């Protein structure tokens, strides 16, 4: 795109953060207008500021813009947990469309530790007359949202058949993922064991079902 | 103050055709643009045009000025204030790249320099552009497991695997069950198909008090399943409540 | 004032699209009949 | 400046439904038929020569063809008219015979 | 479905004729906000 | 452009604004059955005093438009500036401050040109 | 405080002063037997209008109070301002008047508005 953002920015609880929106003279910003959009992924975006400093209907006064002759500002004062999320802005006018820029990926610091809820499921009767073999890895309640998850086939690592999932926000303003071991029938009922291993800050957690009982 | 509707997610082909539709209602139709914005995975959230609904003039951008369509019909009066309407829109020439989520946008204001900016938005459509073709999903029963001893809880699902395309929609009991239940996405697997799963919290003591039936609907294959789950579970660390 | 509905197709009642305002409206002869309705404004299009 | 202040506008289209008394309207050219006033046209307001239309547009508003006045103003009038039209005439008392 | 030819109240011959017309009155004093004040 | 009476109706009332001097020039225009019209073209002249009286104990007389000083309360529809005048017609609105308009009245012919005008026999003794 | 319509009439002119955007409020007020009405708020209008024309003809035309630029004559009771707008109501205070009322009237339609106006006919030209 032809409008650059800043990549990353961050901010604490209670506090304000600043989000850069810029790019060359053809879309930034003189004789432009510029707004911003609430965009979480997977969602409906919700229309936050229009026209360089004015506020859309309904939207709270925590949120305020400002433009310069170069580039726009948009300040979150007072951060909630539920502001964690990607905020793109807008170069139009009147007669021209809109042109977003690259995203900016707000991450809000000084919110509490969340220990991730982990349970794993075996195969059920009717994939066993298949008959397949799937373990499913669920993965939920943990911030922030990156977690790394690793498999073992009686307590030896595992390196065929192992896929998960980008962490996803949830509603509860936490991250959900998901991780799926594909598996031969033979496997299942040669091993003593099978295990979900999944790393968070340092922290392993680790479940683990057996098929010997 | 009103609500955009649009039609149900399709799977094209690439050089052929797609109509999504837009039905709208709670304002007037004609007094507000109709916004299109599409949304990849490649290129990013990109803006393609809007059209007045009144006059019926159209702008669209330079890189959808030479295969997309957009086309309104007439506005149907409900009230003085508030009406029904419907947009639509056709991109011919599909390719790889075209695959993500399209929204229509109601505009701001009806007056002013800021006339056309999109404020009410949709829910979206899905738009998969793919050679290959419709698989129908394998719903599995997930049996119930222990997720706290002391509290007396537990965890029942269902399992969606192998389906193409997305999306995947799932409820309980038509709908009567909707608290503590967490759905995951899929999963792209090596063979292009994807993989969900769903989970319901409920508690060790209502068995023969309440029905689970997951209901999984898969619109592209045009399939409806309502699977049973067995409150009855395997986990010895629930099995000790019982 | 007196509002004038213009649809080509309307029940007398509902919201009309077409409104226009008029002073006075059209030259309405008042003929007494019964059964059939004589010498009144024609209906466009399809039948009302 | 940012703190509002109301401004009172006078003429603005704004109107509410409500009944009145409604007065006629017969062209010239059916004054001109005379034979000593008939029908009603007597003290009637000649027709305006152009009449003018205007198109309120994007405007929409609710009629009520069962809920109108100005029919039950029209029927009263028809009656009363019939009446008066009947008053100086000659009265068949005397045809009971 | 059988249909019969009635009558009766002459009202209904007007509401054939009546159907597109109402009666609305004007009321042009409407007050409205602006950043706009009078003088000391 | 001129739409003529009642044109900008539909119009938001910024640009219904510029039909103010429309939909006043045609608010006054200039045996029984004649009795008909007299008694209704005494209402219309009663009607168009009635505003006029009001329009004139308020700090305006001269008509079509004028300012007042009178902070506008939140509480009667708080919709933003370029939110009315650029997103709403005069009759849309005049249906939501209907609640308020007897309200707002009182604070323009009592609070103002009768403590206004006093004020004024106080700055021009001197 | 609202007294009502005619509420100051006992109290003083400088008090009943206050009141005057009240009395102003209810005096225009929005088959035989029927016509009994008719015939008399007709009256009603070309009473208001009698009083407005005077109002506008002399250095007015803004209603409930306005300056002129006529002397007061001690022949018309010459009384103190602290004896008329302290010591006096409205009635009492008319009622003496009344003599000169006529002749007052002749000052500030005449004398004023049309050698004021003519006036700045003169000065509006430079
Ligand atoms: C009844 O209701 C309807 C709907 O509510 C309402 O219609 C709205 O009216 C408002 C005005 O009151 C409109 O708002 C304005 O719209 C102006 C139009 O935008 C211009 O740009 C268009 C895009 O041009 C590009 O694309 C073309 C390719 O198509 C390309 O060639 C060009 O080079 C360019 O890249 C253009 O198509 C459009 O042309 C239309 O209009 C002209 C007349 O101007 C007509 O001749 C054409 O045939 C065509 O229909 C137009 O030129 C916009 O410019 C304007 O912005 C200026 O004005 C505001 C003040 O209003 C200033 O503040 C601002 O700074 C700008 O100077 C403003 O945005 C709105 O778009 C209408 N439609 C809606 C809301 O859907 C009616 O007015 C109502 N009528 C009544 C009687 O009530
Ligand atoms: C009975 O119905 C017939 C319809 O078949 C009536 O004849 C039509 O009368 C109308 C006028 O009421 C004519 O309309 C005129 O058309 C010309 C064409 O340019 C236009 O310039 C005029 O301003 C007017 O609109 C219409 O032409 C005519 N039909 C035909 C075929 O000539 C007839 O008048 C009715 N009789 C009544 C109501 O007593
Ligand atoms: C006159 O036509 C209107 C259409 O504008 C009818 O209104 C609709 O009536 C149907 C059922 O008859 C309802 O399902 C719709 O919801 C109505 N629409 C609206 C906008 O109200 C109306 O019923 C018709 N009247 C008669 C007597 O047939
Ligand atoms: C209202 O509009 C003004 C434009 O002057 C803007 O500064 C302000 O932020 C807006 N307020 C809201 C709540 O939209
Ligand atoms: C504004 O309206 C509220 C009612 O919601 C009222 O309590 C308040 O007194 C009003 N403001 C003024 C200045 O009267
Ligand atoms: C005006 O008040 C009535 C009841 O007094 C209420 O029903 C209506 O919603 C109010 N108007 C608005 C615009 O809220
Ligand atoms: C004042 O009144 C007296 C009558 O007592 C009269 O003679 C005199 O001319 C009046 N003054 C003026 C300026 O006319
Ligand atoms: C007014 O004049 C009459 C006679 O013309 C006289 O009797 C009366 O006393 C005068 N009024 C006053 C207050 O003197």
């Known amino acids: 795109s032809v409008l650059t953002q800043s990549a990353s920015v961050s901010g604490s609880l209670g506090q304000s953060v600043t989000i850069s929106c810029t790019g060359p003279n053809s879309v930034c910003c003189s004789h432009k207008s510029i707004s911003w959009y609430q965009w979480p992924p997977g969602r409906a975006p919700t229309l936050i500021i229009y026209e360089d400093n004015e506020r859309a209907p309904g939207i709270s006064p925590r949120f305020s813009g400002y433009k310069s002759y170069w580039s726009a500002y948009l300040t979150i004062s007072d951060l909630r947990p539920e502001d964690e999320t990607t905020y793109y802005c807008c170069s139009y006018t009147h007669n021209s469309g809109c042109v977003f820029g690259t995203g900016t990926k707000v991450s809000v610091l000084g919110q509490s530790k969340a220990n991730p809820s982990v349970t794993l499921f075996p195969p059920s009767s009717e994939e066993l007359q298949a008959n397949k073999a799937t373990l499913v890895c669920l993965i939920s309640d943990f911030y922030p949202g990156a977690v790394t998850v690793a498999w073992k086939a009686d307590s030896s690592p595992v390196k065929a058949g192992v896929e998960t999932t980008t962490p996803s926000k949830q509603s509860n303003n936490k991250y959900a993922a998901s991780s799926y071991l594909s598996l031969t029938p033979e496997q299942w009922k040669s091993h003593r064991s099978y295990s979900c291993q999944v790393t968070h800050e340092g922290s392993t957690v680790e479940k683990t079902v057996a098929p010997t009982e | 103050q009103g609500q955009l509707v649009q039609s149900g997610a399709e799977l094209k082909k690439p050089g052929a055709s797609v109509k999504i539709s837009c039905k709208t209602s709670?304002?007037?139709?004609?007094?507000?643009?109709i916004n299109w914005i599409r949304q990849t995975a490649g290129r990013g959230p990109e803006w393609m045009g809007w059209?007045?609904?009144?006059?019926?003039?159209?702008?669209?951008?330079?890189?959808?000025?030479?295969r997309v369509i957009m086309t309104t019909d007439t506005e149907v009066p409900v009230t003085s204030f508030t009406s029904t309407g419907a947009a639509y829109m056709e991109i011919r020439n599909l390719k790889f790249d075209d695959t993500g989520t399209y929204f229509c946008?109601?505009?701001?204001?009806?007056?002013?320099?800021?006339?056309?900016?999109?404020?009410?938005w949709g829910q979206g459509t899905l738009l998969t552009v793919s050679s290959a073709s419709t698989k129908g999903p394998s719903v599995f029963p997930l049996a119930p497991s222990s997720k706290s001893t002391s509290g007396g809880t537990a965890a029942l699902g269902c399992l969606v695997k192998d389906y193409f395309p997305e999306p995947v929609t799932v409820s309980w009991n038509s709908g009567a069950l909707t608290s503590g239940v967490h759905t995951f996405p899929a999963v792209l697997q090596s063979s292009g198909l994807y993989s969900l799963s769903s989970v319901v919290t409920v508690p060790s003591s209502s068995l023969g008090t309440q029905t689970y039936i997951c209901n999984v609907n898969h619109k592209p294959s045009n399939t409806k399943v309502d699977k049973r789950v067995e409150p009855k579970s395997c986990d010895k660390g629930l099995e000790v409540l019982f | 004032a007196i509002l004038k509905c213009k649809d080509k197709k309307f029940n007398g009642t509902g919201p009309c699209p077409s409104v226009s305002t008029v002073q006075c409206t059209h030259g309405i002869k008042p003929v007494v009949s019964t059964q059939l309705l004589l010498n009144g404004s024609l209906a466009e299009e399809e039948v009302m | 400046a940012e703190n509002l202040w109301v401004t009172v506008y006078y003429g603005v289209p704004v109107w509410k439904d409500a009944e009145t008394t409604l007065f006629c309207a017969s062209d010239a050219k059916a004054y001109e038929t005379e034979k000593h006033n008939v029908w009603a046209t007597h003290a009637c307001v000649p027709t305006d020569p152009n009449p003018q239309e205007i198109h309120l547009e994007n405007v929409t508003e609710e009629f009520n063809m069962w809920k109108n006045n100005m029919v039950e103003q029209m029927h009263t009038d028809i009656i009363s008219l019939w009446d008066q039209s009947l008053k100086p005439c000659v009265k068949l008392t005397p045809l009971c015979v | 479905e059988t249909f019969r030819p009635g009558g009766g109240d002459m009202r209904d011959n007007w509401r054939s004729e009546l159907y597109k017309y109402k009666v609305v009155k004007i009321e042009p004093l409407g007050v409205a906000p602006t950043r706009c004040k009078r003088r000391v | 452009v001129f739409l003529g009476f009642l044109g900008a109706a539909g119009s938001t009332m910024g640009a219904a604004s510029m039909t103010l001097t429309v939909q006043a020039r045609n608010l006054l225009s200039g045996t029984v059955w004649g009795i008909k019209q007299l008694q209704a073209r005494v209402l219309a002249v009663e009607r168009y005093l009635r505003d006029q009286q009001l329009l004139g104990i308020w700090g305006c007389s001269g008509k079509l438009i004028c300012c007042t000083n009178v902070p506008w309360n939140s509480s009667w529809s708080n919709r933003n500036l370029s939110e009315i005048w650029d997103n709403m017609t005069w009759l849309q609105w005049d249906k939501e401050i209907s609640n308020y308009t007897q309200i707002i009245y009182g604070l323009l012919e009592e609070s103002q040109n009768q403590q206004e005008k006093n004020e004024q026999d106080l700055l021009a003794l001197d | 405080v609202f007294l009502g319509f005619l509420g100051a009439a006992g109290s003083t002119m400088g008090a009943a002063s206050m009141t005057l955007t009240v009395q102003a409020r209810n005096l225009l007020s929005g088959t035989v037997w029927g016509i009994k009405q008719l015939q008399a708020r007709v009256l009603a209008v070309e009473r208001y209008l009698r009083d407005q024309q005077l109002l506008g003809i002399w250095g007015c035309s803004g209603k409930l109070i306005c300056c002129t630029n006529v002397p007061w004559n001690s022949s018309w009771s010459n009384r103190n301002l602290s004896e008329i707008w302290d010591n006096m109501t409205w009635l009492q205070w008319d009622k003496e008047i009344s003599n000169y009322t006529q002749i007052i009237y002749g000052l500030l339609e005449e004398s004023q508005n049309q050698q004021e106006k003519n006036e700045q006919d003169l000065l509006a030209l430079d």
């Open positions: 946008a109601k505009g701001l204001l009806r007056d002013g320099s800021s006339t056309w900016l999109p404020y009410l």
């Open positions: 709670g304002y007037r139709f004609n007094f507000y643009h």
């Open positions: 059209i007045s609904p009144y006059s019926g003039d159209k702008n669209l951008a330079p890189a959808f000025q030479d």
